[PDB]
C-alpha cells in the first residue's frame, strides 16, 4: 500500500465512489 502515493490513492478511491 505504501508503494503508491497516498495523496493520489485516496483521490482515486474518491473518484471511484463518486
Amino acid at each position, epitope marked *: 500500500a*505504501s*508503494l*503508491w*502515493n*497516498w*495523496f493520489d*490513492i*485516496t*483521490n482515486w*478511491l*474518491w473518484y471511484i*465512489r463518486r
Partner: antibody
Framework: EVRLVESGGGLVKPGGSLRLSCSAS????????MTWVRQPPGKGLEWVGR??????????DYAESVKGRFTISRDNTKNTLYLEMNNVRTEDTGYYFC??????????????????????WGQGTLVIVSS | SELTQDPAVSVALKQTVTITCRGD??????ASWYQKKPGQAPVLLFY???NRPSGIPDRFSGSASGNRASLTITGAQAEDEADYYC????????????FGGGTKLTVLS
C-alpha cells in the same frame, strides 16, 4: 517495543539555528510517516510538520506559522528524524515531540487525503529561545 | 483556531462526560483524540470512524456529526483526569493537520 527519543534541545538565541533529532526503533521506520509536534509552556499541542514515505517522494508539509524557517528531513540509514530550526523566534519556545504517524481513509465516507493520527510519541525535548 | 474545544470540563466519579471539538474540516474529515498528562507523552485514544487502539479502556469512544467531533468517557475514573486534544485537517482536503485548543478534564475528588 516502539521507542522514540528526542534530543538536541537547549538554549538558542533569537535568529539562531538548532537541530533536533529523533531516533526511532521497534517499527518499520522507512515506510512510516513521521510528525513533529510542539507544546509551548502552559499551552496546547501544535502541529509543526510531517514527512511522508517513499511512495510520496518523501514530501514534507509544514504549519503556516512555521514555513520558511523550519526544515524536516529523515535519515533512513540511521533511523532518525530531523527538525532544523532557522531564524528561530521566541514563540518557538516549547517542548518538541516526534510522533509515528498513521494514515486513515474510509472508502465510503472519507474525503481525500483522509486523516493522519499519531500512534506513538516520544517524551519530548525542551527548546528555549532567549537573547 | 480551526478546531475549537471547551477549555475545562468536570465530571463526577463513575459518571459520563462528553468533550466536543468543532471546526469546518470535521464536516469532511474524521478526528483523532489524545490524552495528555503533565510530564508524559500524549496517548492516542480514538481515531477514524470507530477505531480504538488496543490497551485503551472501552470507556473511551468517539463520534461525529455535522462540524462536531465528540469524545465520550463512560464511567470516568480518577486516572482519566488529564488534558484531551482533538486533531484533524485544518481545511477540507488539506495536507496539513491541526490540534484543538485542548480540554482540561477534572474528575471531581
Amino acid at each position: 517495543e516502539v521507542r522514540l527519543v528526542e534530543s538536541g534541545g537547549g538554549l538558542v538565541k533569537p535568529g539562531g539555528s538548532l537541530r533536533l533529532s529523533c531516533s526511532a526503533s521497534g517499527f518499520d521506520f522507512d515506510n512510516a510517516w513521521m510528525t513533529w509536534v510542539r507544546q509551548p509552556p502552559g499551552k496546547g499541542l501544535e502541529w509543526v510538520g510531517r514527512i511522508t514515505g517513499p511512495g510520496e517522494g518523501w514530501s514534507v508539509d509544514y504549519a503556516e506559522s512555521v514555513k520558511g524557517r523550519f526544515t524536516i528531513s529523515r535519515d533512513n540509514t540511521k533511523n532518525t528524524l530531523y527538525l532544523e530550526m532557522n531564524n528561530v523566534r521566541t514563540e518557538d519556545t516549547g517542548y518538541y515531540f516526534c510522533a509515528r504517524t498513521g494514515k486513515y481513509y474510509d472508502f465510503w465516507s472519507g474525503y481525500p487525503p483522509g486523516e493522519e493520527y499519531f500512534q506513538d510519541w516520544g517524551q519530548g525535548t525542551l527548546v528555549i529561545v532567549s537573547s | 483556531s480551526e478546531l475549537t474545544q471547551d477549555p475545562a470540563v468536570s465530571v463526577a466519579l463513575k459518571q459520563t462526560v462528553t468533550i466536543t471539538c468543532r471546526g469546518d474540516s470535521l464536516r469532511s474529515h474524521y478526528a483523532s483524540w489524545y490524552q495528555k498528562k503533565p510530564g508524559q507523552a500524549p496517548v492516542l485514544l480514538f481515531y477514524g470512524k470507530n477505531n480504538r487502539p488496543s490497551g485503551i479502556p472501552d470507556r473511551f469512544s468517539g463520534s461525529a456529526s455535522g462540524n462536531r467531533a465528540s469524545l465520550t468517557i463512560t464511567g470516568a475514573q480518577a486516572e482519566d483526569e488529564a488534558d484531551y486534544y482533538c486533531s484533524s485537517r485544518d481545511k477540507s482536503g488539506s495536507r496539513l493537520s491541526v490540534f484543538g485548543g485542548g480540554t482540561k478534564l477534572t474528575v471531581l475528588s
